[PDB]
Each structure stands twice: as structure tokens, then as C-alpha cells.
Ligand binder design. Structure first.
Ligand SMILES: NS(=O)(=O)c1cccc(NC(=O)NCCNCc2ccccc2F)c1
Ligand SMILES: [Zn+2]
Length: 257
């Protein structure tokens, strides 16, 4: 049973999941003097249908907002992709304090949290379960979250947490378009990487936005007040769930800009 504490955390994951020391692990530090601009990269295009929003779930180490993924109502196209990728989830990562909650870093700078909007390749594969382990199976947009002014676009998400306070609780989460959470510019970096927690499959093409979005100290406190225990047990707040950055191992981060 993996987690983020000192006994089951990132630094121990390789014992149960050897891919943790792999050649395509995420997150990474994006060193902008080493990025290579690629004129062949097309703009990112997202088109999400709010009716695909389904459920919010406390998964112990985090919470997930899941989407109906039976058709192409909600898709990501463009960027480095020739295939259409189907939205299935978004979630966040955060840290113990405002100093350090993002997963990716830019030129060594740590942000306070990070938004992940995840998709799977429905042109090539028949389901998320099939796609999750394929090199070209997943596409995840990462948005760095900079502590500052309260972000009103987060309101529905934050308001839902009181119903899923403890591990395993879940609730309907409907009529929501998560492209409202993205920054106004979709200039991006892209690199081949992995899931940032077990099973850590090297199946993710990452799309990291250049522009950050805001989040307030108090909104971050709402994340950290989620509980990792089941109802009735001693309360254990979800204090952090970000993985340290991992070596590029010769990978190239491409810039759309
Ligand atoms: N931090 S991340 O690398 O952007 C990222 C992105 C998409 C999903 C997750 N986590 C998550 O799905 N947990 C449920 C675990 N069983 C479902 C499952 C298993 C393997 C792959 C995907 C998947 F959905 C994390
Ligand atoms: Zn994530």
C-alpha cells in the first residue's frame, strides 16, 4: 500500500514498482534554456461537454473528479497529437505548505499546487484500462497553480469536498466543464513521461502550460483538510501528495512557443 508518508512514499515506491527508476518518469524540472522550440507543434484544442462530468471521489491520497468516457463528447486535440484523446478525470496535487506543492517545476521554481486534466487515446484503444499502459495511451495537461488571489473558477470543486471528507466517500459531480480551469494562454511544453504515482506507467504525453493559474492560501487549506482515513477512524489530513521531480535521462522538453 503506497502513499506519500516517509515509509510508503515516493522514495520507497521503487521497491514495489521498479519503473520508478525508469527513463521516462514524471514530474520533471523544465529548464527553459534547454527546451527546444518545435514549429511542428500545433495549438492545443480542448472541447469538453459539461454533461460528461460524473462523480467526485476521495481516493485516500487525493480526490478525483471523473467523467463519462463512453464517446467523444469531451476531447483534447492538437499539440503534438494526431489522435483525439478523450477526457476522463481531473485532480490536483498540493504540498505541506505554500512553498512546495506542484509536481512539475520550471527553472527550479516550485509552485503551490498543480492541476492535472487527464485523457486517453480513444483513436487507438478501446478503454482507459487498455490505454493506461501504452506509451501513447494517455495525455495529461498540467497547470501550475501559484498562490495569490482566490480563484473563483475552483468554487464548485471546493464546495463539493464537504461531502467526500473521508476515504472512499463519493458523490455526484455534474454539469461542469473543466476547460474553465485552464489559463487563458495555452502555450505549452511537452515531453514523454509517466503517471506521477503508482503504477507509474510510462504512458503519458505531458502538456505543461506556460501560464499559471491562481489559488489562495485558504483554498489550498481546503485541499489539506481532506482526510485520508475512513469515517470513524482518527482523522489524518491529506497534507501533501506531490512527487519530487525526476531525471530527464536524455529526454527533450519541446516548447510550443
Ligand atoms: N498524477 S497523473 O500522473 O496526472 C494521473 C493521471 C490520471 C490518473 C491518475 N490516477 C488514477 O487514475 N488513480 C486511480 C488508479 N486506477 C486507475 C488508473 C490506473 C492506471 C492508469 C490510469 C488510471 F486511471 C493520475
Ligand atoms: Zn496527477
Amino acid at each position: 500500500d503506497w502513499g506519500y508518508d516517509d515509509k510508503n512514499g515516493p522514495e520507497q515506491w521503487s521497491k514495489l514498482y521498479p519503473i520508478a527508476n525508469g527513463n521516462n518518469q514524471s514530474p520533471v524540472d523544465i529548464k527553459t534554456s534547454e527546451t527546444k522550440h518545435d514549429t511542428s507543434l500545433k495549438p492545443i484544442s480542448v472541447s469538453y461537454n459539461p454533461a460528461t462530468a460524473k462523480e467526485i471521489i476521495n481516493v485516500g491520497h487525493s480526490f478525483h473528479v471523473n467523467f463519462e468516457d463512453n464517446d467523444n463528447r469531451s476531447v483534447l486535440k492538437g499539440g503534438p497529437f494526431s489522435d483525439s484523446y478523450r477526457l476522463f478525470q481531473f485532480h490536483f496535487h498540493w504540498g505541506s505548505t505554500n512553498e512546495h506543492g506542484s509536481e512539475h517545476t520550471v527553472d527550479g521554481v516550485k509552485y503551490s499546487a498543480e492541476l492535472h486534466v487527464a485523457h486517453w487515446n480513444s483513436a487507438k484503444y478501446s478503454s482507459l484500462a487498455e490505454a493506461a499502459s501504452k506509451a501513447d495511451g494517455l495525455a495529461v495537461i498540467g497547470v501550475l497553480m501559484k498562490v495569490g488571489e482566490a480563484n473563483p473558477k475552483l468554487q464548485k470543486v471546493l464546495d463539493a469536498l464537504q461531502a467526500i471528507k473521508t476515504k472512499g466517500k463519493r458523490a455526484p459531480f455534474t454539469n461542469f466543464d473543466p476547460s474553465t480551469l485552464l489559463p487563458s494562454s495555452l502555450d505549452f511544453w511537452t515531453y514523454p513521461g509517466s503517471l506521477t504515482h503508482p503504477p507509474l506507467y510510462e504512458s503519458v504525453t505531458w502538456i505543461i502550460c506556460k501560464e499559471s493559474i491562481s489559488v489562495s492560501s485558504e483554498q489550498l487549506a481546503q485541499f489539506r483538510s481532506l482526510l485520508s482515513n475512513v469515517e470513524g477512524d482518527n482523522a489524518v489530513p491529506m497534507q501533501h501528495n506531490n512527487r519530487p521531480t525526476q531525471p530527464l535521462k536524455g529526454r527533450t522538453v519541446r516548447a510550443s512557443f
